[PDB]
């Protein structure tokens, strides 16, 4: 297959030209007017990107009907991404190898698009190795089972490892503190029981830690903060990177941390309920800034469905969390279009920096595996979630008229058309 008049990002630059794909998928030749006997399909100078990476999504094994790894590939093409990151904390969780290969073999069997498993740490499995693990995730707050370090005296073992570790990092005794000042009456307590301090406290445990493994010890984790939502932690992330020698530290938001604020939250009910909670417009501007100054590594959805029926209860019955995979791309293309960011930061956020931190080989380089995600940066038009292809068909961001879409997704060489190409 042929796709001809493509704006390619290749290296640091667009480049014009087409790109051949062999019929392994692999990319066989990158040339401008490439003259061959092939299925050709034009681009018609859409931008081609390396494909997208959405670095942390829950597709719900062991709880089938809120999404499964079908629903949430086709979600993810639907949304231009080509490769998504996986969270442990399932029913069961995943905290044991044989666990992680049954789930495994449950993905490799109905994932549409490249899917990779982290692995969940607990106070009793910490030292294991899971080869085929990206990342080994640890929640500071109860998720599931035992996938929670409820002691955080042992975090200074956990993290002296040469491993990737992903931290949810939410301080459990502020919250409880905070549960006994404050009741759940209505969206906004959520918001004031999981607060600001709660996020900070936690990021202070763990680099109070990082510290000491810098200086004690010749192991050299690299610690990649999920979700940070506050203008504090994110300075003092900015601050003890001055100071670290062997550890590496990565951080990631998401698009409704970079959109929404806690003014929103009786307006948003279950919609704007998710863990961490809606901060301040502040927080939402120094987000944005921290990519701008490269503080903020990356963008991920934290893609997590829960029944409709649920979502709509009150906020002591409400689950957190909202699906995000089919918007994290158009929401971020629209902050290039407003201004925001640019679109090498948007290009940089999305595709090149998780492919650095994770691993993962999605770049358009001839004798590669195809996995592009193909966008029309112009495009406007309304998010509509009854175009999901999550079986969670509801989003805050519903009914937003955004300019950016992917309108097409190529996985390991083959073309899927994206939310935009129907739009
Ligand atoms: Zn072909
Ligand atoms: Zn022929
Ligand atoms: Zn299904
Ligand atoms: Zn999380
Ligand atoms: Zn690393
Ligand atoms: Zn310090
Ligand atoms: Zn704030
Ligand atoms: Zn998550
Ligand atoms: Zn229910
Ligand atoms: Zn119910
Ligand atoms: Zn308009």
Redesign the pocket.
Known sequence: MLLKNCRIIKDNKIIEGDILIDENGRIKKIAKDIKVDDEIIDIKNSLVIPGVIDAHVHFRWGE?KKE????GSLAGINGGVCFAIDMPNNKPPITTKELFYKKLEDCKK?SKINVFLNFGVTENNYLGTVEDAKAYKIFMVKSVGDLFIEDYSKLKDILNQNKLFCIHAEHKDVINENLKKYQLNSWIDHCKIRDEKSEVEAVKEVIKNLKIIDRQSNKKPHVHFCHISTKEALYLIKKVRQELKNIKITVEVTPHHIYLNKDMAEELKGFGKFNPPLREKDDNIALIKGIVNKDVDIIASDHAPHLLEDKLKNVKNCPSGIPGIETIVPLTLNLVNKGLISLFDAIRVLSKNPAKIFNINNKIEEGNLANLTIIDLKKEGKINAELFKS?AKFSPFDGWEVKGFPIYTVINGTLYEAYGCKC
């Open positions: 089938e499964d790894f079908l629903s109905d079986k």
